[PDB]
Design a protein around this nucleic acid. Sequence first.
DNA 1: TACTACATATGTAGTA
DNA 2: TACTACATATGTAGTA
DNA 3: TACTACATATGTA
DNA 4: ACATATGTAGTA
Lengths: 117, 119, 115, 117
Amino acid sequence: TYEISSAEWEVMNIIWMKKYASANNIIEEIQMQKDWSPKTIRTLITRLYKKGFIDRKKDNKIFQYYSLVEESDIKYKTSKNFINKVYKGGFNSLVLNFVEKEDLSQDEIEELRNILN
Amino acid sequence: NKTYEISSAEWEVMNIIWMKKYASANNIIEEIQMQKDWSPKTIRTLITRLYKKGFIDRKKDNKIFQYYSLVEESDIKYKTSKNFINKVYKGGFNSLVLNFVEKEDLSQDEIEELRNILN
Amino acid sequence: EISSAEWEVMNIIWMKKYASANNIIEEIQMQKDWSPKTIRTLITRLYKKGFIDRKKDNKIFQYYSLVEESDIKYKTSKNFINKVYKGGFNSLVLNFVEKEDLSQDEIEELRNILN
Amino acid sequence: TYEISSAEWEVMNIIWMKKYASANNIIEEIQMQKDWSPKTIRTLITRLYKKGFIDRKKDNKIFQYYSLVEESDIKYKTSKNFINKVYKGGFNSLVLNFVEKEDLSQDEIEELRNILN
DNA sequence: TACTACATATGTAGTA
DNA sequence: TACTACATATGTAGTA
DNA sequence: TACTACATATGTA
DNA sequence: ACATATGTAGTA
């Protein structure tokens, strides 16, 4: 089983957010929210290339990478893996822990209802 | 500067500690040796690391140490989850709950509780 | 058979034992979004299939279940698993753990549900 | 959104069971646990083909249909849907519903524990 | 208990 | 782009 | 409440 | 192609 590293996650989102994406195309978008070498980043791409979460496509004269797995399909999958290891009481016990630490503003708490519908 | 995290493997440990407030060497093992399958040594190590990371502490209560948490549960869990979501979900907490219902991971029995948890 | 959309109604009725035309609708027009007529239709169907019956309690019909709830859900899930999971019930629970859909808070209850 | 109908399922399981499968190779294995026409079946496959759940492969001189979706990954998902449409209280409320209707023998109740581990 | 050992996964980047 | 290199961190567990 | 219309998904062929 | 069951919903 191949898993996606937290450092890596950075990358996927950048790709997921742009469907298609290039070596540098990504770096530029990362070298702003993070601070790594353009070489360190590239390795994070190849790494995901090999784990096989994305693929290439010599679109221009350069590779263009794209996801292979479904974003939300995987994120749900990963949170579920996490929470399970952390919170003994599934998804709920967690939500109950956000409000306990009042991480919710009435403007936001409102949206949820209209999200549970 | 040096910052220390609590490993996902380690997390199992805290959960027992936290669950018993006071906790001995084996006391934990016995309690993990059902929800998991490690060696009573592997585990003890997890404790120790957690001790040197400084999330727990000891205290020879009887003739054997009793480790106890140093950090506050809810305090840390909420903190950890935030870190997670931010790395994973681009749209914060919301975007996540949205993701669970799109995957129908909730029963109206549960979805109900939430509201009465929102008020 | 009882259709998935129809299920919505039976839940309401079983929830209320006794149940009226609109009384159903109201309790449905929040957890769903259909036309009061669509709904009504679902009831008629069920009445016609013979899962529920009427009874002019006040001056309007009062439908109630004819089939025993837990007796049906059990029957229904049986047919289901059978069409989907090759290995009966087991092979299902097994599918739920492998996709970690269970929190230890939850897995716990099971044991004491198994004794 | 495209779904997999109860009838269809009989086809997939034949397929996932043999990973690789032939038009007739299927019918054979179904005309024992079921009673349909070698044309009724074929159509179920077709539908599934178009819905996009399986795909063909001219292996010999005949097509060989193979699964396109991951078994466990979808059965999990469908059950989910079902459970929540029916049982108010998710998975739990269901298992508790099998015991009440004593649909379990101590021989099998055992396995569970060792399966919950 | 305390202290020791190790192979893989991960963060982070220089050279062909 | 491709391929190489390394130190800390994490999973697992033997020896004093 | 009671009959009918309608596009879709669906059981059978 | 064809009949039925189904999500939705208006004219009886």
